[PDB]
Each structure stands twice: as structure tokens, then as C-alpha cells.
Amino acid sequence: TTTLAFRFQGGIIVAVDSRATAGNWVASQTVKKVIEINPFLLGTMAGGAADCQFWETWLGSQCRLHELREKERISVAAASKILSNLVYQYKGAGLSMGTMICGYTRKEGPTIYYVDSDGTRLKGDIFCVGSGQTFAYGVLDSNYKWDLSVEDALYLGKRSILAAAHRDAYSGGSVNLYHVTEDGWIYHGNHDVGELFWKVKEEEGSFNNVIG
Amino acid sequence: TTIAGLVFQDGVILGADTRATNDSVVADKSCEKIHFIAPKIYCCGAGVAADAEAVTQLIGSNIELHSLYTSREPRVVSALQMLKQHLFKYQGHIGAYLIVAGVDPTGSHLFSIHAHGSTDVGYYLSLGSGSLAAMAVLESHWKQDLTKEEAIKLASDAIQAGIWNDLGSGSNVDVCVMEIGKDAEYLRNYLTPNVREEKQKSYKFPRGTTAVLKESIVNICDIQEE
Amino acid sequence: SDPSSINGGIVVAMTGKDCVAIACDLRLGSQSLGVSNKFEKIFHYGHVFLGITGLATDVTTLNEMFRYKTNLYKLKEERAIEPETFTQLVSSSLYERRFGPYFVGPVVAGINSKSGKPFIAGFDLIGCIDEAKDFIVSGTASDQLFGMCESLYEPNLEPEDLFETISQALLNAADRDALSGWGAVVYIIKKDEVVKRYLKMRQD
Amino acid sequence: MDIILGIRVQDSVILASSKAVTRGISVLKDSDDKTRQLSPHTLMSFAGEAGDTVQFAEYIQANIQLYSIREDYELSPQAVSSFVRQELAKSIRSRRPYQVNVLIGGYDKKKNKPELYQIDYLGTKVELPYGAHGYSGFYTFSLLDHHYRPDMTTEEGLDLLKLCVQELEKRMPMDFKGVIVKIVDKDGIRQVDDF
Amino acid sequence: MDIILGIRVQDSVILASSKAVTRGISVLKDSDDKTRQLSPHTLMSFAGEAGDTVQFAEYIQANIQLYSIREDYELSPQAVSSFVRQELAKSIRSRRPYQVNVLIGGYDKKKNKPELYQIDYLGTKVELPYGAHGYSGFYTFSLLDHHYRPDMTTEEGLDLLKLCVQELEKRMPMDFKGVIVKIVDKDGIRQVDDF
Amino acid sequence: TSIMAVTFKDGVILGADSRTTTGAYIANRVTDKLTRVHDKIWCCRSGSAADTQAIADIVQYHLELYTSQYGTPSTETAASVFKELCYENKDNLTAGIIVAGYDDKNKGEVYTIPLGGSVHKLPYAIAGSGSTFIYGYCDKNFRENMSKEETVDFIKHSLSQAIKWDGSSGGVIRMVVLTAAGVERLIFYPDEYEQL
Amino acid sequence: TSIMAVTFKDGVILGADSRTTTGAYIANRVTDKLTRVHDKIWCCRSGSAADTQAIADIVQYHLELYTSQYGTPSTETAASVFKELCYENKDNLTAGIIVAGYDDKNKGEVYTIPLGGSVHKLPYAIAGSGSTFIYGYCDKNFRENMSKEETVDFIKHSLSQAIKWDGSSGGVIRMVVLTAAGVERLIFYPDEYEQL
Amino acid sequence: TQQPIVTGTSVISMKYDNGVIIAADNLGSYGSLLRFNGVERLIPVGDNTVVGISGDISDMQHIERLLKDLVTENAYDNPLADAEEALEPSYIFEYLATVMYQRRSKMNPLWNAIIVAGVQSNGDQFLRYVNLLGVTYSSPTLATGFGAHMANPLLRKVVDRESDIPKTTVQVAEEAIVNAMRVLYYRDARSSRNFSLAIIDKNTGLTFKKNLQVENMKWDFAKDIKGYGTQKI
Amino acid sequence: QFNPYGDNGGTILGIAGEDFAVLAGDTRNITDYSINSRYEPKVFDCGDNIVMSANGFAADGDALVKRFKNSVKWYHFDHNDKKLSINSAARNIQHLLYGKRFFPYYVHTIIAGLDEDGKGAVYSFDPVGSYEREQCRAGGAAASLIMPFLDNQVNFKNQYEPGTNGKVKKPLKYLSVEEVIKLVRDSFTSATERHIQVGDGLEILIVTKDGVRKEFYELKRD
Ligand SMILES: *[C@@H](CS(C)(=O)=O)[C@H](Cc1ccc(CN)cc1)NC(=O)[C@@H](NC(=O)[C@H](CC(C)C)NC(=O)[C@@H](Cc1ccccc1)N=[N+]=[N-])[C@@H](C)O
Ligand SMILES: *[C@@H](CS(C)(=O)=O)[C@H](Cc1ccc(CN)cc1)NC(=O)[C@@H](NC(=O)[C@H](CC(C)C)NC(=O)[C@@H](Cc1ccccc1)N=[N+]=[N-])[C@@H](C)O
Ligand SMILES: [Mg+2]
Ligand SMILES: [Mg+2]
Ligand SMILES: [Mg+2]
């Protein structure tokens, strides 16, 4: 599991891998680790598959109830805090979640909140979560600037997940990309690592450690 | 594993299934659990497979050297005594459970040996995870003065009981018949009740299906020479 | 903690018509961290091939040990060791470390130079021999390989067909194991020619 | 000991090794050299349990230096790494094993090639274009996967190494007090005094 | 959370708190403010177990802010610290205690005096001229014992605090990514943006 | 296991059940627990079968070598050799052995050697898991200088009760009679002893 | 502890030793383990003294309240109340109780309630640590429809052996006779029963 | 959570052409002590069902009372209690299976293995197993404890699959059960010679046989067995 | 200590076709090395053209299926006999499973049916209710043996067009019901050979627009 989200000039990039494991058994290569809470809100999933999927789906219901009651879109801060206050009630029971709540609102601008199952809630510009986080951080921190093109930022997020997919045994399958703007989130496709890796190797001239 | 031994009119017979396992997976569908010690002394093995194999081979080797030294046919009690003293020494850490049977100048014999070095004498015995299934059959049908034809039937039935009802046991039935005044006859794949059925499809691929990065010839010979 | 699944990797061997095939992945890791994508697990001593999965320090140590022993064998016997004899040598050498064993899953493959008979064998970490007509599997994705082999395999395959079968058995098994993959090698072995092929596979 | 990196470029091997020595609560030293010269063209960096690291390094150093005097000849990096691996592989089944991981960077004067070997405390040897031990690799391998080329110069190798150290200084929790960097090439071993 | 310091000088209280947030392997953030304003002249810094720290701080903040609206009056630092102590002392015999240590720095507008309270997760309260939680005090108290005077200016208090942070940056193993410093005086709370 | 040795006028009788269990499974229902270390020195074995067999085999070896050099050993001598093995290896053994033998000088003698490796010379002895249930019965019904037929009945009735209550005991009741006349083996089947 | 209840022609007799131990120390050498839950329904207690006293006190309360409403309870009813407490609180109790009583309709009845909280109606019952040593003796010597004098001798001889072999048992043998004639207490001292 | 104290061993059973047979010995063991020799572990419910129980005897006695109470409760306001609204084997089983699974789910199980044998209204054979975990299964032969390991192999030689049921008569089925009980007496250290057997037939109804004994026992070969290896005398 | 869980073995397999779906499972039920039953149905028709199996600990599996069947019944009562769609069934099963998050159902659950466009659908759940729609899924003891084979034969993984070097993948196709059943039968025959807990019989439930049909095949009984 490698998930990442970073803020830049043109909004937020969100990229995740698509692998789920039971120990060393690769259960799936086609898992969805991004939940579309609404047209302006995204949640990323790391840790327990069930815990994330259940509570982030529940979060979407709570975000919907907010906009029915208040006639207004829920803030990223408020949405992230509903989830963080929930997991905090369950603290010690053994929930396992590492998550990022990413969205745009007019009052906040583009915002990313890291939330996890031991109750931590952090606002920030860059986050990587999961067993492959360190690998993603390596690529991301080196080529990160505030003012990337949307095209370059989408590539960096994709490339950072690829880097982790390669090195981290528990990350892989495919890369799912999102871009969050003023107008909402936009899906930028599912990219199979088995085809992407070779494509990137040839075009970029990277991965010289590999027999190709 | 289902191994068994029983005596009949002028001999002793051993039986064994042919399944080797690693926890829940079947490693081998045709393995020989009836080990050779001497020409007319055989050993059914259960427990740790390497241990049962190693301990029978070692005692078989020492029995051969003893036989040469003494100019005599080896006795089953010698194999028994040597096996138990070895196993006792290691305090069960060699996890071999054995049924030893054979013919010698004293007569026909049938013993069992446990991993800690205890031995039993019996007219019919069974060991391994299928021992209870086998012993149920042996307790129902064994009698004194069995003919060879009845003995092979009963032994194979006892092993079959284990094959069908025990998950640890399976595949085929091996038998070894040791009769007085005759060559021991070893009957591997005596029964074959578990042949795999013909498959629905052939999964043979079109050639070039697999993507290949490099090819090279391996030099396996000594010295390419001038 | 479990030594046989720290480094990861797999070996599979198959028989065909007047040929054998042995294949392995190329990964070496420290649990989740991938370290090397060039760690070959198949070695050869004359015409006898040995694949070894398990703890990588023991894979290397045993290769060096069997090179040592087969070199001395050849000097004294004045001929290369045969697969049937080498199988017994592997078993002997593993069992002598019964109470402090090497954490490995060896696989012997080769053609007997005199009889021309294809031969494969597998072992547990303490030397119990599994001599198979059809195929042998080993490593962290052994369950996956058992499933692939048991359905894909048919007897008496020609060398170039057998290559496709063993390759597809390895590749699809490796892709369902976190600790295997990162490249693969397949040896096709005939009585007096051996072809080695590196496979293109997904690098995650 | 914490971070040890290695990178093999066109004509040299570069080893970077952290300076901090921490015993529990306090940082006792911030200028520790976690390396020994085994022969004029072979350098070994090391990290692991306190005491065992230096004891092992110096023991290897003495044996290689003894070989050099006896034969009036420098062992190849490959031969040294095989010797080191066997000592660790012997160690792991001892009463008390050496808990030491090493990188061996050497220039093979016969083949005119730099060579980098990574060996862990179990005796697990691998030849690599770039290597690390412990948690360092989790951050640095993804960078090196991206930026590495086999035909890089020594200056390009040092710039790529600065990028690795910056990433470690950003994302690792422990203050490892910077790195001592050493280059191994055809002319021998030298220390980059400003890094 | 790692290092939180406090120093009470002549006419103000200065709280310094580390910026790092580390979850195991990685440093997730390097700009974290480990403090909440409880009232206009009372600041509480905090450190302890993840989640519990902020949950507790914000819970105290809400209660003090509720008191302020109800009575149209600011509670004294002493009163706030006694409230906080009781909440922690109640907590320690709960099903799941708050693992949070705090410093409360406040300016008492009635007495015209700065006040620094140190309270640990058990509910152990002490008024001090200078205080710390966790391993910070092991390094910093000996300095403050040497250099502290009660009549120091705020600028002298900040220089003395730089000397504390430099010592921590030299001798502590963890990279705590520097400190956010805040001053509490008669005019309220302000952040020193360059430190 | 239920085992006993009883001295009487003409000599001594050893008695035992025939059940060997691995937990609740009966591994052998026709075990012979009465084992010969010398012509007229026998023993009853209880505890680990491996341990008691290993000991008995060593004692038989020692007494065979004793006989070659010094002539027939006393029952006391046999008990001493059993003791020496049991006591010196007490940390690695689970053996409870009753030694019984016939001299012409000393007549019938019984020695019991429990877990610790102590020796106790007694008129009769009982041991094994099933012995707990017959302490009362045996104490009330034992007399010194019984006849052969009385001693066979005493053992048969005793072990019948031990078998009845102990799950670890069962099968046939084997006995071995040791007198000047020689060595007699007796067997008694369930249909005989259960109806007592 | 050695306790037993034995039905006979005229009714039932309960018997017990008088020893209470804390480890190897004898805390009380003259304990009364025969306890009254109703006029002619008594019980013998074994296991935790606290637990068996607490249970017996509750049963006595229930049967007193039963008697006020519905008249004299049956022995079966008393056993059922004991069972209900023992079974429902099996996780927190260590109680092994024998219930014995005399009706005129049913005559002498004995119910045993072991650790689990099961009930077993029997002609006679034995329990406590010292009972293991007399299973053999009691099975061989018990007859149905014995006289009072025979049943007193049977209990006296039985508990004498239990006391002899069990360290946890000892002291005086107390007995309580339950017949149509009434309730008779008997006591037997060491100098009487040891020489049996 | 508890541990079983007084216990009952194997219950064995099988289907035959017109009904079902079930059997169980009369012993209540107290560990290795063969404490209670008169314990009935087959408990009939009406004239169409027999519930055979192994495991903890105090929990068995509780279940026995639940079934007795179930018959009472079914009779309440039920004019067809002895006809169309009588208790079926399937009803009795599903009740027990519900209880067993509920009790395990509160971490306080009834420490038993239960086989419900009977014949339904339409003449169909009913035979189903349930245990302390609430695990349930049906098969032409069923057995608990040691019976699973020793009786099933013997009974499966008579009825190996569903199609063998119509071919199996009551004499052949009872013979197989009685032989299996002898085998268990030879080999189970916590078994007894005395047992009860129940036949539930769709034509002849419920036949309950008490005080049966294992007979025709082979012990004679024991006399020739001497020592543990080398001993001749 | 009392252990509330057990392992009854078995293996199950769901495959989604173009206008159909299959859910297969072996009929063997085991504990440790004993066979409990050679024919104990594991795959159930739940109504509304949905088939379900919960493989693992059979008591938890039976409980879950029983609760879902009841959930279908109450969905009809509460929502005017509306057909429970396969996607709605799946979400309902997540909540059933997650309700016992801190005392889980020890089962791997698979359901099969048709989606609201008439296309074949398979859904698969972990023990605590994480789920995913899949084209292909094996669960239980021999899932590790069967899944790689299905990756290769159903989804055509690692298979390339011959002569294209290795740059055109074998194109994805829907399989016919006859082809799927051949792959199901060969998967279970293979799994029976190498896994001791798999055998006795194979029961396949096929779901089409016409309804739920059954097929049974013998497997090796050793
Ligand atoms: C990677 C997270 S990691 C290993 O920490 O880097 C992924 C992320 C992820 C996020 C969302 C989703 C949504 N479907 C999937 C994956 N997480 C995992 O792979 C976790 N895996 C699980 O939770 C798996 C999931 C199944 C589908 C393989 N399940 C289990 O690990 C256990 C659950 C279980 C619960 C009770 C009793 C027994 C088992 N089971 N199984 N089988 C991560 C934990 O690996
Ligand atoms: C049945 C034994 S049972 C199930 O206990 O009744 C068979 C008996 C047997 C005897 C001999 C031979 C061949 N000569 C085959 C079978 N035993 C087994 O199948 C054993 N299997 C093993 O021992 C396997 C064998 C390998 C070849 C699959 N080895 C292991 O399972 C373990 C062995 C091991 C044990 C202790 C320490 C290290 C290793 N290993 N691995 N890896 C029986 C164990 O199942
Ligand atoms: Mg990977
Ligand atoms: Mg892989
Ligand atoms: Mg008995």
C-alpha cells in the first residue's frame, strides 16, 4: 500500500496503488484505495481494508447529512475531524487506518488532512501513507516544487507510486490518479504497473538496476 | 500416513499408503514408506519423513556390516534393538515411528517402534495419522492362521481405510510380503484406486505466448577445445 | 523471524520428452524491502542443475558446498556426477545438519548422461527426497506453483512447448506472491544442449 | 550504527557513512568514521550492534593485510567480499553471532572496474550499482532507481548522493549528524572533506 | 510528541515546543504547533501519546472558553492550571487515561506576574521558574540552574532558550526539527517567527 | 497401568494388566509388563515405556555379566542396579519399577523403586496409575505366608478392581509365578475377572 | 477429606472424617463435615470449605422456605437445589457434595454432586481426596439392604482405610444415621478404628 | 469458559433403508477415573427422535431438561401435539443448534457433541450433528469423539454414499453398529462394555435397547505375546 | 482455554461471465484430519437470483448465510417486494460482517449473480466486511492453488500474442458457460490432488436471467 497526496500551484494531486495482501498472499491487484466522498472530496485508504472502506463510506454519509442540514458543502477540516473523532472513540480496540482527506472549498482552498487510527489529525502540503510511503517520499520530495505544471504534477504522483510499487513488496498492481481543482476532482485513469514500468523505464532512462 | 503390519500362517506382511505431506499440502503422491533394512527385513515409517528414512538407512547399513561380520542372516531383533537404542538416545527428537517386520532363522517377527525408543510386540499393528482407521479394520477382521491371500486382502483393506477416511493418508497402497522359506516380495503400487481423471481441457500454449528478454547457450561441457 | 520467508523466491522444475526444464525468479529481499533483482537461484555442476529457495545466505553457502563436493567427486571418480547420485549427496548433506538445518528448499534437475532419462527431485530442509515424474516446486509461492503445475502440466511435452508451460507456471505463481518475482530465468535442458532464457515479467 | 550508503559509478565507488554514535539517551560523538581500509583499493563500511561492528571490521582488516604481506599481492574486491561473506555466514550459527552489516567498495585493478558488494549479518551477499543497510534503503533506493545511470561521473555520483542525504535528513527521525564520504577508484581511497 | 520547554522571566512566560511529528519510520510533518490558547493571557503546550494530546488540549480549550463567555471574565493562570490538573488526576484512574503532559504559561493580570505550571499525565502540578517534560529536562535543567535569574528580560530569556535548544540539537538522538517559540505577557500571546 | 508383586509361602508372584495408552487411545491392549532381567528375577514396569524398557535392558545386561563372573545375583543386587540407574538419572527418567525375585536362601523378595530412585523392601507392593484405587483393598486383604492359590486370587481380585476404576488399566491380567519349582506364566481374560 | 453416604434397609447413613488442612498444616482436627440442610436431609461437604458452607447455608434457607409453603421437601428436591447452585456457578465454585436423606415413601436415598454440577442418584457414594483409595474396597464389600450394624461397620472400615492412606483425611470418624426412628449421631476415635 | 469434568465418550450412528440407528455407552468418566457406570446418554424425544450426547455430563443433564421442557411447551394450546403438530427431529435439532451456537458466541459453551437421529413425518431419515462450537453437518454415518476416528471408517464400508442407504437393511446396519461398539471398547480407554442402542424406523417406530454388552471379544491371542522384543519366556 | 473458532476446510470459486455467473464449492467438510461429511452443501440459493457461500469456519458461515437470507426476506417486507440487486446485497453483507468487527465471522464470503444491466457479477469479502466486485475469485483452503490459474485462464495474464515480441497482450474475452465450467472442474480436480482438505464432490450453482441451475461432479475421495 502506497498512497500519496500533495498540494501544488494547480491544486491537489492524489495517487494510490491498487494492491491488497493477507500477509505475503497477494489477494488482489484491482482494489480501489480512493473513495469519492463527493465531487469536491476524496479519501485515501491505508491500513486495514475493511476499517478504511467501512468508515470512509460512513464518512460520506455524514458529509451528505451535513449538506442537507446546513445547505452547504462540508469543509475539508470538518470532514476530516468527523472521521478523526470517530476513530478516537475506538482507540485501543485495534482499528488500523492511515488516511488522507483531500478536497477544495472556497473558504479553505485546496486542503489535505492526514488522519489515522491512533487519533492523529494533521493538516499539510505533502503526505505519503502505507508500507511503501518511504519509497514514495524519496521520489516526491526530490522533484517536488510548488509550481509544477498540472501535467508534471500528475506524472510525479504517478511516478512516486511506481517507485514504491517496484521496491515495496506489499505495493503494486496499478496506479489510480486524481487531480483536485476549484471545480472538483478529475480522474486521470488506471495505469497498470506491468505496462507502466517498462514504458517509464524506456522513456525516462530510469530503473537501470533492472534487466530490461 | 497409514502404515500397518500383521502376521499370517507362515509369514508377516506390511502395508503403507503413498502420500507425503507438508501441513495441508501434498508434496508427494507416490512415495515409498516401506523401507528396506535387509533382504528379508522391512520397515514401515511414519512421523518425520527424513527421520524415518535416515534411521532405517543407518540401521540397514549397520545390519549389512553386522551380517558380513557374523556370516549370518540378520535378525529382526537386531534391527529392533539398534533402532530403539538410537531413537532412545535422541529422546524423541528423531520423530520416527516405525513398524518393523521380517523373516530370519528364528522365524517371522512383527514389532512397532515409537520415537522415544519404546517397542511393542504384536500380531497386528498400525501407526501414523490413519492408524485408528486401519486398527478399526484390523480389530474387526484379524484372526489366527490367516492365509497369504486373506492377509494381503486384510492389510490392503486396513491401509485403504486410512486412505479414504484420513486426510493425512492417500493415493496408492504399497505392500511387502515376507514368508518363511521364500524370497520377500515387495509390491509397490499394489492398489491404484486414486488415478486422476482426464482433464476437461489441454492448457498447452501457443508458442511465443511468453515474452522473452534474452536468450543464451549455456556451456555445460568440460573445456571447449582447439 | 521465519528464515524460509525473509528473502523470498521460487524454483520450479518439469520433465518433458527427452528433456527437463528448471526455472527460478530473481528477487532477493529483506521482508518488504526489495534488495536485488539479479539473485539467481539455479546453479549447475557439470550437467546436473540445482535450484535452491529459502534463506539466501544458505542458498549461497550450499552452492559453494556442492561445488566443492562435486569438484572433488570428479577428480576421484574421473567423471561428472549424475542427477540420481547428486540427489543422494544433497540429502546426505542436509540431514547431517538435522538439528541445526539449512533453511532451504533444493530442487535437482538433469538428464542422466548414460541412460538419457530425464530426472527431477525436490527436498525439505532436512533432506527428505521427493522424486517426481511430472514436476517439483519450491519457495514462498510453492502453493501457487502447485496449483499452476497441477493444471497446466501434461506429460511428454517437446522442449519448446515445455518452455511455455513452465514459464507460465512460474510467472503466474510469482505474481500472486509478494516476496517473489522481479524477473525470472528458465533453463531448457536436453542431453547435449542447454538453453537459458530470461523472461519479461511485471516488476512489482 | 545507523546509515551506510554505497554507489558504484563509471570509474569509482562512493561510500557514505553517518557520523553519529548514540548510546541511548545521549549522542556521545558526531565525527565517527564507520569504515576500514582493507587494502589500498578496497574499503569496507559497517553498521550494526555496538562493539561487534569495530571488532569485526578490524578483524577482517588484519586478515586481508596478512594476506597482502604473505603473497605480496592485493586480493580482488570479489575475493575480499567472498572472504567477508563466509566469516559472517560462519558467524550466524555461532554461540554469539556478529550483528554487523557491511558494504565493501573496491576498484578491481585487473578488470579496471569499480565494484560494490552489500553483505548483511547473515552472510547475504549481492553485487549492486547502489546499496544501503537498515532503514536508509527505504528512502534512498527509490531516488537511485530514478536518477542512477551506469556511465555517471564521480561528481554526478556525489550530487546524487547529496540528494540521498538531504532526503534522509528530511524524513528520518534520528539526527545522524551528517556523513563522511569516501571515494574508491584506480588511484586508491580518498576522503571528501567537505560534504 | 517530543520536546516542550517553558521559562518564566521578569514580565513574561516563554514556551518553546518542537515542530516534528514522527510516526514510526517517517517524519510526517516539520511545522506542528504543539500548543493551544486557552484564554487571551494563558497558553498551554502539550506532549504525549498521539491523538490524546490534541483531543485533551482542545477539550481544555473549549471548557476555558465556555467559562470565559459565561462569566465575561478570564480565569487566572492558577485557576486554569488547577482545572487542568484535576482533569488529568480524574483521567489517571479511568478505563483509558489521557497520556498527555502539559506546560501552562500565563500572565496573571490581577497580580501583574508571569506564571509557569508544569503538569504531568498523572496530575502532578508544580509552579516553576523553568520547566520541561520528557527527556528535555535531563539536558536543559542544568543550564537553567546555572544561567537563570528571576529578574531577566524577555530577550535574555530567549537567549537562554537558544542555549537550551542548541544543547538539545547537539546531544539528543531525535531530530525534532526546531521549535516554535511563543511569549505570554501583559499584552497577550505572540509568536516569535524567527528562531 | 496396574502392577503388583506379592510374596507368599513358596515364593513370589508378579501381576500386571496389559493396557498401554497414548492419551485416551489404547496403543496396545495386549502388552507384557512383566519382564525378565534374570531366570528368577523379574520386574513390573510403570511410567515411560521407553525409559523402563531402556533401564530393564541395561539391568538384564548387568545381571548377565554379573552371572558370568560371580554366579547368580540376589534379588537385592538386582534392585540395587535398578536403583542406581533410576536415582542417578532421576532428572531424565519417569520410571516406577517393582523388582521381584526368588532365591532358595532368601525365598520370595519384593523391592519397589518409585520415581525418586529410593528402594523399599516390602512383603507386597503395588504401583502404576490404577494402584491408587486398591490401597484400601490390598491392605485389608493381604496376609503373610499365603498359599499359591490364595495369592493368585488376591492379585486377580486386586487388579480386577484397579482395571475397573482406572481407564489407563485394562485388557488381560498377566501373572508370573516365581518358586523353587520354576517359572510359570498365567493369563486371565476379561470374561473371567470382570464378573468377580 | 473422606466422605460417604450409604443406603441400607432402614434408611441411610452419612460418614466423614474430621480433618481440615491448609496445605500440610491441620487447621482443624475435629471438623464436622456432616451438615444439616433439613430434619432428615443432610449432606457431606468436600472441596472449598468456604464454598460448601456458603452453598449449604443457602440450601438450608431454600428448604426452610420450601417447608413453610409446601411441607417437607423430598431428598430429590434438596439435591436439585444443591445442583442448581453448583451447576450455574461452576466457574466460581469448588464443591463436591453428597446429599443423603430419609423419606417414609422413598426410604433412604443418596445423591452425589461432583465438581461439574451433575447429579447422580446412587445406592452409596464416596467422595473427597481420600475416596480414591477405597473405590476397590467399597465396590467389593457393599451390599444392598444391609442392617444398621453392618452399614456402620462398612463405613467405619472404609473411612479407616481412606484415613490411613490419605494425609488430607484423619481425626475422628463422625457418622449420622437417618431412619424413621430419628437422627442419631455417632463418633469413633482413632484408638478404635486404626486397629481394624 | 470452563473445562469439562464428568464426561461421556463416543456416540455413533448411521442411516439404513427405513430409518436410523444410534448408540452410546453407559459411562461417565471423571478424567481417567471410570466414575459412573449407569449413565444413559441416549435421550428420546417423543416416539420419532433420539438425541445422543457426548462430552460434559452436567451440560448433558441441562440439555436433557431443555428437551423435556420443549415437549411440555409444544403440548401447550396444541390439540395436534400427538399428531400433525408433534415435535420433529428437524425441529429438535435446529433448537439445539441455535442454543449451541448462541452459547459459544457468549464464550460460555455447552461442552458437548450431539447427534440428533430420527424419522420425519414424511418417512425421511434424519441424522445431523452439532457440537460446542455450533458446527453442524449431516452424513449417512455420524460419530463423535473416538467414534469419528474408528466407527466411521467401519460404518462407511456399509454406507459409503447416499445411494447405499436403500440397499442397507436394519439387520446389516445394527450388526455394523454393534461391531463398531466392540472396536471402541478394545481401543478407547474412556469407554465401557455396557451400552444403549436405539433404532428409529418409519414402519416399526422407536425401539430403545438398554443394558447391551459387547460380546464375542477376541483376547485369546494375548497368551502368546511375550516381552517387548527379545524376551522368549 | 476455550477457542470459539474452528476450521472446516473447503474451497469455493466464483466466476463472472458476460450474461451469467457461477459459484462453485467442494462438498467436503472436515475438522483436523477427519472427514465430517462428503456431501455438505456450502453454496446456497438466497433468493432474488443471488447465490452465496461463506467458506472457513462452518458455524460462522451458516450463521452469516442464515442472516443474509433473512435480510433478503425483510428487504421484501420493508420495500414492497423490491428485488435486492447484487450491489445492494453486497453492501448489506459488509454491514453484517463489520457488525462483528471485534469478534469476527471466520469466513471468506463470495456472492454471485447478475447486475442491473444483466451482466454477470461476483463480489468477494474479507472476514470483517471489506469487499470488491471482481470477475474472478477463489476462496478458502486451496485459494492459493486456484487463483493464479484463474489469473492465467480467465483474465489471460502473462499471455501475449505470438510473434508480437511481447507488446500486444492476449485480448480479454468473455468465456461461455461451457468454458467456465471446464475451468471450474479442472481447478477443483487440480486442487483435490494437492490439498488434503479438498475433495469428495463439486457442486456448481449457475446464475442466468432464467434462474439458478445446479450441476454436481464427483471428486477424488482420498
Ligand atoms: C495496504 C495497507 S499496508 C499492508 O499497511 O501497506 C492495503 C490498503 C488497502 C486499502 C483499502 C482497501 C479496500 N478494499 C484494500 C487495501 N491494505 C491491506 O492489504 C490490508 N489487508 C487486509 O485488511 C486484508 C484484506 C483482504 C481483502 C486480503 N485482510 C486481512 O489482512 C485479514 C483480515 C482478518 C480479519 C479478522 C480475522 C482474520 C483476518 N484477512 N484475511 N484473510 C493489510 C492488513 O494488509
Ligand atoms: C505420514 C506421517 S503422519 C502424517 O505423521 O502420519 C508420512 C510418513 C512418511 C514417511 C516416510 C516418507 C518417505 N520416506 C514419507 C512419508 N509423513 C509425512 O508426510 C511427513 N512429511 C514430512 O516430514 C515433510 C516431508 C517433505 C518431503 C514434504 N516434511 C515436513 O513436513 C517438515 C519436516 C520437518 C520436520 C521437522 C523439522 C524440519 C522439517 N518440513 N519442512 N519443510 C510428516 C511430517 O507429515
Ligand atoms: Mg513490489
Ligand atoms: Mg510478485
Ligand atoms: Mg479399564
Ligand SMILES: [Mg+2]
Ligand atoms: Mg484431497
